[PDB]
Design a binder for these strands. Structure first.
Ligand SMILES: N[C@@H](Cc1c[nH]c[nH+]1)C(=O)O
Ligand SMILES: N[C@@H](Cc1c[nH]c[nH+]1)C(=O)O
Ligand SMILES: N[C@@H](Cc1c[nH]c[nH+]1)C(=O)O
Ligand SMILES: N[C@@H](Cc1c[nH]c[nH+]1)C(=O)O
Ligand SMILES: N[C@@H](Cc1c[nH]c[nH+]1)C(=O)O
Ligand SMILES: N[C@@H](Cc1c[nH]c[nH+]1)C(=O)O
Ligand SMILES: [Mg+2]
Ligand SMILES: [Mg+2]
Ligand SMILES: [Mg+2]
Ligand SMILES: [Mg+2]
Ligand SMILES: [Mg+2]
Ligand SMILES: [Mg+2]
Lengths: 143, 143, 143, 143, 143, 143
RNA sequence: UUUAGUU
RNA sequence: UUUAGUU
RNA sequence: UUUAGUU
RNA sequence: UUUAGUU
RNA sequence: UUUAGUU
RNA sequence: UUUAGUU
């Protein structure tokens, strides 16, 4: 069962929406990294999250295993952001995002190992400032 | 452009993850609605959000216009929750959700009229307590 | 290249939105079929088009080949009607349709053989009279 | 309920398939605009429809609200045209389209306000003349 | 990099299309599972693969972690089988499948840990013997 | 019913996974062609398969009919390879594939005419050698 | 869990 | 068309 | 509409 | 990787 | 197969 | 925005 005070999803979201909180999360054993990326190319959003996650040590820079888990978690988060077609520029739209990646065990059982959450918050709209509205996305996966 | 203090998406999410914070939102002019629904049938989730939204007065009980806006906002939020196949029971999975619906103008220009946000947060997993992880979804639409 | 006077897609649509215009189409060599179906189950819509198509002789009642072509043509038309999730009842929505199936060669070269078009037109909406709007779909396939 | 002689969907389609009809629609209070666009890039089809709709006055050129409604209506129409993957060039295919955008109240109740329909008709196929077949798409949304 | 003699995907497929080749795979350290399932309900296919996988010991019966990895691997394999809409009965089609689940490390580095492959092969078609053709799907995931 | 020793799907797969077999297939009346393509652009994978199929005579180089059947078969195979989003480069991923196209009648009834199968096998992953795993895809269609 | 099926 | 690739 | 669940 | 943008 | 429907 | 296109 999920540990009520270790909900990796809720935690990554609250962090993202509240502009410290990182040090507290880290003290509790979480691996954390925040970042911002904007683009009309989805691969760039994927790249920033991966680069930030590897440089901040949220995931191993070596091997495929952890990169694979993060890729699919990012994909799941992109579903919430794109809602239907995981396309930006080709569909005449752009995104301005802030992201958070959290890694750790959210379950009561230590045997559940580590899991990872990718959360995205920002705006999506036509490529013209103001013609936009909010967008959110959260992907969760086992590492 | 979006009004920094009126980000309907962010506000509906913060509320969902928390006192009558509703009182404050309502005092500021927002039409608010909170509820909970769990099921293996997506139509039941859609129904609870609609019913609760009409009963609380977040949208007009009469006409199609506002129901239509809410339905699509709900569909968009369901993308973040299902991430790929907007299916539950048929894919051997169930969802336990808490939801919020916020209606109002989030832009600086009052000419933008009302918009509506549907936020979902809970767990999704196999039909067995514990075999689950968090799920999240936000849909925004003009109304 | 497509024969200007034999645009199967356009012709099946015009027929659907209208005298036995069938007589004229049939005199020109087209195998035509018209019908109506309403439901909250997509499989019932697929079944009516198939049954009506076989009974009217638009496709062979024996073998798989022609049934296969029609099934995919129907799937393609269903995309225009559902626009995203080929789901009805499970997404708390219902459809009221009128359909047409036209079979024949729409190209200048007679070597292109027969092709089939499935056209759908009606309304889609919540399970409540009036809370609905139009829906449309066309699928084309070789047969 | 939908007004039988004000079916915005059927009307936009009939207009598109019949090469005047505009003046009659306009006299009845409809905001109308016709256009043609061909491309291997979906954003270009979206751009043409938006530009034509704004220049002809079918939607306000200012604000996001109406642009937002038109964007989603165009997206819905693209589902019928692409059927599965809202991709053209990346999937080695191209489209040659004619489009119509109609705006007005199709319901018996004046309270339903304005709605908008985006209709597309043309051909889709490999990037080689003749290797193609028809394609249709209709998206309907509230403004 | 992937170990030429340990390509889990290829191996699970070859097995599915064939003596206890299981014995050889097991001797090499692979956890293997073979089974068959037919249905018009995708959840029944997912259930048989899971049950058979846990009973045979391919994945842990306890905890969520490994069930989670298998569920997604199964979802991915279902994409190849359904190709578009992960639906069966609701789309008037049925499936007759044979499946294999292979677990182990397919990379040269032992640090990559275990991965899991789900392979499906059988027929898909209308609910009528003979009106069908082959279907195939492979899903791979870290575990 | 499908002829047990003429299963076009299984046959194309076995050929693809076993590095002759072509001459034997050809002697039995099958039209066959093997090839390899790698890219971050899906249209290139589609192009190689089409070019190889036409040059090797698996399908007529003239007319649309057979090109149309092959296009959709390739699309169906790509579902198994991409599983969700038929995108490569835009989603920061690349594929290294080997492909086989088989054409002939797999049914007991000669009246079923010719059918075609497109099979893909290789690896998919981030654009960095080693950070990848296997991927399969099979599409079947009537010609 | 130990291959489905009629409009 | 004659297997791709670094954020 | 006032959180779901076993193959 | 250290928030995008005009048809 | 001979247009659906309430949370 | 004033119908696209070769592997
Ligand atoms: N509203 C679109 C984005 C957009 C494009 N153009 C205008 N807005 C979405 O939901 O993604
Ligand atoms: N983890 C799945 C849900 C699930 C089904 N079975 C186990 N878990 C998801 O992301 O939706
Ligand atoms: N408007 C929805 C249908 C609907 C469901 N509820 C209300 N309307 C659609 O486009 O399919
Ligand atoms: N037939 C494809 C288009 C195409 C691409 N190549 C040949 N035809 C479709 O339905 O979109
Ligand atoms: N041929 C369909 C299945 C089917 C339904 N009806 C006839 N056949 C597919 O590819 O899934
Ligand atoms: N694992 C991804 C490919 C990938 C991209 N980056 C790393 N891997 C897939 O299943 O397609
Ligand atoms: Mg999951
Ligand atoms: Mg939007
Ligand atoms: Mg086609
Ligand atoms: Mg709608
Ligand atoms: Mg993967
Ligand atoms: Mg098929």
């Amino acid at each position: 069962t999920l540990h009520k005070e270790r909900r990796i999803g809720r935690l990554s979201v609250l962090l993202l929406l509240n502009e410290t909180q990182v040090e507290e999360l880290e003290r509790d054993g979480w691996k954390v990294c925040l970042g911002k990326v904007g683009s009309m190319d989805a691969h760039k959003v994927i790249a920033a999250i991966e680069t930030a996650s590897k440089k901040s040590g949220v995931i191993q820079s070596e091997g495929y295993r952890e990169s694979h888990a993060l890729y699919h978690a990012t994909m799941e988060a992109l579903h919430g952001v794109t809602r239907g077609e995981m396309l930006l520029g080709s569909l005449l739209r752009t995104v301005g995002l802030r992201f958070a990646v959290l890694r750790g065990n959210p379950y009561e059982s230590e045997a559940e190992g580590d899991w990872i959450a990718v959360s995205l918050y920002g705006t999506i709209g036509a490529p013209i400032k103001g013609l936009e509205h909010e967008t959110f996305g959260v992907g969760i996966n086992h590492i």
